């Protein structure tokens, strides 16, 4: 077993058998950054980041990579579509993706609205179930 | 008996200024003399010198001639007195040099610099709460220096401004500039410049449509004047001194204060050089009389009180804010030191708007940078969905092909594609979508020659104001 | 077209022998006469004879040296450059190394740098041995803003802590020792803070932690016979005292000057001849329309080296890239040589930091100990 | 497996299914207590810690 849990001794105690990696200049990366008791996974990161999400998936696909930490959807998405894949662990750190404006924007609050409007309309996961998780491998 | 003296070229407010001193001696609480303004500087020097070697003059007072000299006049004395460290102080210096205490330590404004009539434009923000404000001030040291102080007046307001232009005096082609600055959605202009510099500014201006409606420039005293009003459109706010150009009641008010240094000075237990030939080294009490002065103070003056600050400027001066109604500076405001009353309600924007107009210039043309993420942005070089409904893959350049850097116009389709195209569909907005160069998020990374750590990337741009907003699959993060 | 401005009467003779010989009588912008103004009390008098001069022959380059290093006059030198467009020189001077504002039309062009290249000379300095500056002591004199501001941004970039921000107005002494201050980065006058200098020395700050450096402005700047505050040492050293100051704390005044002379000639030909032109400026003290114009001719001076000094000056007439001295005031009150600054490049005595750097060290302050160590397996790897 | 090692979830994860114990006022109980990010397990010896060695 290559990683039972976010408890898994492997994910605790960094080694060169996995080469754990995530995207440079990520979210995710600042949040191992910023985790506590975990400096080794942030060693681990800045010695075995991958550039991009695609060659990640790629390298982990074919074996190169032999785990690569990204959000659950997108990554549950693209395991889906291409097969040959799993993926491991819960959702241990639940977030959200939403919109980025600028300070003090007066647009965001609609956009805002727009959201809960697109959750009433499920205009989301209309565009989901259209073209995200049905044609898998 | 004290020696002072006073520099002006009148010739006839020498009687009154000594019958003014005479009376304030009398009552206030010494011998008086009087100096033409020489035309040249290094005469008006010389002549200084002279007057300070047969005369121990203790402070001397200035002001401007009828005669428009700029800034020549002034600065002889000014440095004469600066060399003896004697503090002496002005009557009509409008400009902020003097007030620094780099060279010219050893002068007094009794009236505030052009630059303090930046401070209360801030209060005039607060009389509408206009926060899309702009800045044009000429590149000068004086312009500098209004805008550094309305710089810091803002961030303690914390209301950070559009952006600020800056002018080369004499330099043409100044439309640069004006539409550089048009698009941005501010709707009032803020503007500082010498005479010629403003009738040119404002001659560039109505040659571009930039005096229509949301458009509206607030300038200070030294802008209108001359050919400019002529030229200024109808309904430029201005500043100006609430004693004008009275030199009478300067010269009071100047008697005044100087009586009350002279009688603080009376009391120290512990007199000038042996005038400017000889007596090379500066007076020991020149640096004492500096000090007393800047803890002594006039109060209720011919022009009310006068409160100077440390660096013996007059505080909390009232000034008149002029419309120019019927092509003339009508009373509509008075910043009664600090606070505005609008005495006359008849304010006529210069676009002709009798209502205020909002600050804010509405904007429609929203740029979005994105991140190539397949789930969420498909992007093909350059087709119906399952259901056989058309694909809504428009337009967006941006990546430099392979990150020889060539930005080449490419498909783009997907969920984030979808939620930005409803929205433009929901709430009527026009897009310009665009990709990011380098390829990343960004992160606080205090890269190479640099000193702290910037964010990059799309958020890098955003906070640049590269994109009005981003649209990608961001996570939500407090940093 | 030559004149020379001193105030030290001795060095006359010598101004009339070493002058030429870095000079037109063997420089070639003489192509086809040396003035000495012996006025060094009033500037009347003297401006009156640069007037007179000017009328005479017209000289292009004119040179002032201060024997007592008066800042007071140069406010007179750059009134008179505004007056008459004419490109001058101030050598010797503590207002050189200040870089006054001058007058859009003056061409004070002084012979010192900015004082914080100076600061940040004693910032690379401190990088080398020191990389925390506990205590900024400055007084009310003008340019204390822009002096925090530089010491900000250069203890930020380099990642420097700060301790104290000691902006001072016995009781001021005392609450200087109220602060846990080791490194004191001083920035100011010598008349105003002489006093202060010697309650400092009289106040305790003369101890092992206590290290004090001093700037330009003070006591430093200006060579030769010594700077005498209260001349070989001046204010008394606080067991440590530091100083850095330009290229010419130990080399001639006299051949400073035939150096700026020959550097103004060699600028003057890159001008006029490089350019087929000739001499038209300013050339009468009254007042006239090409009075309202002027230019500065650090436009034709980077082309200029000697004694391996650059001469690439700036707009506001001071030098990029210079020559400084670092210097230490020692035990024996005389002014030491720490070492010399060129081209960002350091040349020093020993760099060794094992609490180095000042002789009294804080050992005392904060405990050093002796870690004898051997080379051994990964636990301790030497390299 | 109740255990596998320092990182088990059982460990790191209290429960009602183990009943982890140690003696009641003992050095290993003090360092638990000021061990971090672990006062679960602080909280599971509060409410199960055995009176003596010999009973657990």
């Known amino acids: 077993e290559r990683i039972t849990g976010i408890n898994d001794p492997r994910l605790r105690n960094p080694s060169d058998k996995f080469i754990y990696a995530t995207v440079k200049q990520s979210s995710v990366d600042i949040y191992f950054r910023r985790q506590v008791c975990l400096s080794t996974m942030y060693r681990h990161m800045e010695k075995h980041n991958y550039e991009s999400a695609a060659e990640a998936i790629q390298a982990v696909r074919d074996n190169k990579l032999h785990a690569f930490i990204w959000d659950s959807a997108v990554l549950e998405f693209e395991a889906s579509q291409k097969c040959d894949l799993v993926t491991t662990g819960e959702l241990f750190f639940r977030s959200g993706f939403g919109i980025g404006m600028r300070k003090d924007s007066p647009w965001k609050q609609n956009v805002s609205l727009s959201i809960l409007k697109s959750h009433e309309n499920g205009f989301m996961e209309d565009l989901d179930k259209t073209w995200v998780r049905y044609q898998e491998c | 008996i004290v020696n002072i003296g006073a520099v002006l070229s009148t010739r006839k407010h020498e009687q009154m200024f000594r019958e003014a001193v005479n009376q304030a001696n009398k009552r206030h609480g010494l011998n008086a003399t009087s100096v033409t303004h020489k035309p040249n500087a290094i005469q008006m020097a010389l002549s200084v010198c002279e007057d300070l070697i047969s005369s121990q003059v203790y402070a001397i007072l200035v002001s401007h001639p009828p005669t428009p000299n700029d800034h020549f006049t002034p600065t002889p004395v000014s440095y004469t007195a600066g060399f003896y460290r004697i503090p002496v102080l002005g009557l009509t210096t409008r400009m902020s040099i003097y007030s620094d205490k780099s060279i010219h330590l050893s002068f007094l404004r009794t009236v505030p610099p052009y630059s303090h009539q930046s401070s209360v434009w801030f209060e005039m923000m607060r009389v509408y709460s206009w926060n899309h404000i702009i800045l044009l001030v000429s590149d000068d040291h004086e312009g500098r220096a209004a805008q550094k102080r309305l710089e810091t007046l803002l961030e303690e307001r914390e209301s950070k401004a559009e952006k600020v232009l800056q002018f080369d005096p004499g330099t043409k082609n100044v439309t640069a500039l004006l539409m550089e600055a048009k698009e941005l959605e501010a709707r009032v202009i803020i503007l500082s410049a010498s005479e010629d510099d403003a009738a040119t500014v404002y001659r560039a201006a109505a040659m571009l449509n930039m005096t229509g409606s949301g458009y509206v420039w607030l300038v200070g005293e030294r802008e209108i004047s001359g050919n400019a009003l002529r030229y200024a459109p109808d309904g430029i706010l201005g500043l100006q001194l609430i004693n004008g150009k009275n030199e009478s009641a300067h010269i009071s008010d100047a008697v005044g204060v100087v009586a009350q240094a002279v009688h603080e000075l009376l009391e120290k237990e512990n007199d000038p050089p042996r005038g400017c030939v000889g007596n090379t080294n500066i007076w020991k009490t020149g640096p004492l009389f500096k000090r007393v002065l800047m803890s002594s103070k006039y109060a209720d003056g011919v022009t009310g009180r006068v409160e100077f600050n440390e660096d013996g400027d007059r505080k909390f001066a009232n000034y008149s804010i002029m419309n120019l109604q019927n092509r003339k500076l009508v009373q509509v405001g008075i910043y009664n030191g600090t606070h505005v009353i609008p005495n006359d309600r008849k304010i006529i924007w210069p676009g002709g708007e009798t209502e205020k107009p909002r600050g804010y210039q509405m904007s429609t043309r929203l740029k979005i940078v994105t991140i190539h993420q397949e789930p969420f942005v498909y992007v093909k070089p350059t087709e119906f969905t399952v259901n056989g409904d058309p694909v809504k893959k428009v337009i967006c350049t941006g990546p430099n092909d392979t990150s020889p850097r060539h930005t080449v116009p490419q498909?783009?389709?997907?969920?984030?594609?979808?939620?930005?195209?409803?929205?433009?569909?929901?709430?009527?907005?026009?897009?310009?979508?665009?990709?990011?160069?380098?390829?990343?998020?960004?992160?606080?990374?205090?890269?190479?020659?640099?000193?702290?750590?910037?964010?990059?990337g799309m958020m890098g741009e955003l906070l640049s104001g590269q994109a009005d907003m981003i649209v990608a699959p961001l996570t939500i993060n407090n940093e | 077209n030559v004149a020379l401005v001193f105030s030290g009467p001795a060095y006359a003779a010598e101004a009339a022998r070493l002058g030429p010989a870095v000079a037109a009588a063997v420089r070639s912008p003489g192509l086809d006469p040396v003035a000495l103004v012996l006025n060094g009390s009033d500037p009347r008098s003297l401006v009156l004879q640069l007037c007179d001069l000017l009328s005479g022959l017209r000289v292009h380059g004119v040179v002032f040296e201060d024997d007592s290093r008066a800042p007071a006059v140069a406010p007179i030198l750059d009134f008179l450059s505004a007056q008459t467009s004419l490109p001058i020189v101030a050598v010797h001077g503590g207002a050189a190394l200040v870089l006054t504002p001058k007058e859009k039309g003056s061409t004070f062009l002084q012979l010192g740098s900015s004082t914080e290249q100076q600061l940040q000379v004693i910032f690379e300095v401190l990088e080398e041995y020191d990389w925390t500056s506990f205590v900024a002591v400055t007084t009310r004199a003008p340019g204390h803003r822009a002096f925090l501001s530089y010491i900000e941004v250069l203890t930020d970039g380099s990642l420097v802590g700060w301790e104290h921000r000691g902006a001072l107005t016995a009781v001021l002494s005392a609450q200087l020792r109220s602060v846990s201050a080791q490194i004191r980065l001083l920035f100011c006058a010598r008349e105003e803070a002489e006093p202060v200098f010697r309650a400092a020395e009289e106040a305790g700050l003369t101890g092992s932690?206590?290290?004090?450096?001093?700037?330009?402005?003070?006591?430093?700047?200006?060579?030769?016979?010594?700077?005498?505050?209260?001349?070989?040492?001046?204010?008394?050293?606080?067991?440590?005292?530091?100083?850095?100051?330009?290229?010419?704390?130990?080399?001639?005044?006299?051949?400073?000057?035939?150096?700026?002379?020959?550097?103004?000639?060699?600028?003057?030909?890159?001008?006029?001849?490089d350019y087929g032109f000739l001499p038209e400026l300013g050339h009468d003290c009254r007042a006239q329309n090409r009075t309202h114009r002027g230019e500065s001719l650090h436009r034709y001076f980077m082309n200029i080296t000697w004694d391996n000094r650059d001469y690439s000056f700036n707009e506001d007439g001071f030098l990029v890239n210079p020559s400084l001295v670092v210097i230490s005031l020692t035990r024996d009150r005389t002014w030491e040589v720490v070492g010399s600054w060129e081209q960002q490049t350091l040349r020093l005595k020993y760099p060794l930091w094992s609490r180095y750097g000042r002789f009294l060290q804080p050992v005392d302050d904060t405990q050093h100990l002796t870690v004898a160590t051997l080379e051994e397996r990964p636990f301790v790897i030497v390299e």
Not at chain 3, 244 to 272: E, F, H, K, N, P
């Open chain 3, 209 to 273: 932690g206590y290290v004090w450096f001093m700037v330009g402005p003070q006591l430093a700047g200006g060579g030769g016979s010594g700077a005498p505050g209260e001349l070989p040492g001046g204010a008394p050293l606080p067991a440590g005292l530091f100083a850095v100051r330009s290229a010419g704390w130990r080399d001639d005044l006299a051949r400073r000057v035939a150096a700026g002379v020959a550097v103004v000639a060699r600028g003057a030909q890159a001008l006029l001849r």
């Open chain 2, 411 to 456: 498909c783009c389709y997907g969920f984030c594609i979808d939620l930005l195209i409803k929205l433009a569909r929901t709430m009527n907005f026009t897009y310009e979508v665009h990709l990011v160069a380098d390829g990343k998020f960004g992160t606080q990374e205090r890269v190479n020659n640099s000193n702290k750590k910037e964010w990059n």
